[model samples]
Target: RGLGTARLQLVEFSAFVEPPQRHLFVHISQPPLESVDVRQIYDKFPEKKGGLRELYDRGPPHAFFLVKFWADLNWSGGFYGVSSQYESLEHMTLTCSSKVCSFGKQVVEKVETERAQLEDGRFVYRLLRSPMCEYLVNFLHKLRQLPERYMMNSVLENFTILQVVTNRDTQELLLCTAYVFEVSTSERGAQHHIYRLVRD
Candidate 1:
């Protein structure tokens, strides 16, 4: 089944990118649906303090590497371009009225054993089911009937996350993630590339 392969490919690709980390699951779609330009959204409510800028200023080593990978793969599509920003669960709930952050939190609560402990004493929570995943897959399957332009625009216009949730007590951290999906054209056909970044 296409779903099976997509899921497998996502998981495999996640592993390939970051070997030590393990994902509870991976969600894939040919032309990613439900994506919105994150920069546009962020601009609407710019945070002067305690925002992605502040987080990046703290200097997370792997964050730059994630951006480099996106550039290397040419996933930006030169539209509005891509931004690697840190969005917390609380921030997501306030900004996007969607249930993704709440659902992500619920997913974290449900999975008891599928987690890894870091040397720094934080617990890495892996998701078994993601509402965003289900939403994307359903839209992807339905949108398959549409033209290539429709699909291509969807991929280009939207920005989404390939998140790895790390929790320390009540605090949760999303590591080295966001908006890096690409549709590459070749003699064979349009090939989809998806990636997830997880690092302490």
Candidate 2:
């Protein structure tokens, strides 16, 4: 009930804080009812190279907004991330080896397509499933050389496209585009990667 709503609120809210350029799809929860400390997840990166550092400095809602509950696969729950940093499937798998787990976010796009305008943010699930997600998956799968492992692959359906600012004020783009498939190409499971666009 509230799970879906909660995610959408977080998505819309995430954009209200950061600049009009940067996008962010963050995971902020756990199973069996656990509230994620937004800061706890982002604080890990306090330097210029960090993903959430720029967004964090924005303000309140950006740093500490809704802290509650936040995906996929027949082999569910392990360090799931929507990041471009860990492009290698091997690394993403290691991220979920033990105590770590991943949960996809459900954002406003799914709630109501037309009213789903998220300021500097992006289209919610409804819009994403169309061309945006379809093209993204096909393109990345090819670029990453993904094998025939992911399960026909249903996207996590919820995502946040965030941009980060370098110390020099240049824009670095980050987005949340994760999905799940029935099978995995390797023992690593059907893990996926988030996309980041950094212009050097």
Candidate 3:
């Protein structure tokens, strides 16, 4: 669903919106950027014991598209490299199409280890799981999800999951601000969960 993304400054359209008409919190169209506002729309993983099954049945309650798409649909939006007005680009994002829900996506991150042969799988992380991996729903706690564990793993290994994840219900792999992992292990077990933080 991620389509056109134009990075430019976003200004509030309240003043320009023919105040007499009053559209209530409308965003004036801004130009696109060299940076794409790849929108990410995620359906929260269910929270209770049967949450996973409920999620599966509902599919995703969201859609992914660029910030510009919302602008286009909303009022005035354009993709701009340089605008004559502002110095810094205004960041804008589209809204979710449905009601809000809770549940976090799993993130698994790994980087290529020091001993990699260049052909094998190095380190890895899985965030924003696939549509088919229903079996993974087993790991859930009172507050965090599986990817939360990986996020914890990210902190422990110092590998750092630096990919700034954004909306995926719209864009593809390229323009996304992702929860990516940097792998430092060259062996096959790079993805193996080493240790999780436990309170004693």
Residue 157 Cα positional deviation in candidate 3, in Å, after optimal superposition:
28
Score each candidate by Cα lDDT. Answer: 0.28, 0.25, 0.22
RMSD of each: 14.1, 16.6, 21.7
Residues 104-123 of candidate 2 have per-residue lDDT tens digits of: 22221211112223333343
Q: Model 2 off-target regions past 4 Å?
A: 1-33, 38-51, 59-129, 133-135, 143-200
lDDT of 2 at 12: 20
lDDT of 3: 0.22
lDDT of 3 at 36: 21
**Model 2: per-residue Cα lDDT at residue 135:** 36
For residue 84, what is the lDDT in candidate 1? 16
TM-score for each predicted model, relative to the true structure: 0.36, 0.26, 0.16
In candidate 1, stretches whose alpha carbon ends up further than 4 angstroms from where it belongs are 1-113, 117-132, 149-151, 162-164, 170-174, 186-200
The candidate, 1 or 3, that scores higher on TM-score is: 1
Candidate 3 lDDT, tens digit per residue, 1-200? Answer: 12212331222111112221432111222222223221222222323432323332332212112221011102222211111111112232221111112224334332211111212232211211112111212211211232443454343332111111223333321111212122222232122111111111
Q: TM-score for model 1? A: 0.36
Alpha carbon lDDT at 23, candidate 2: 24
* lDDT ranking from best candidate downward: 1, 2, 3
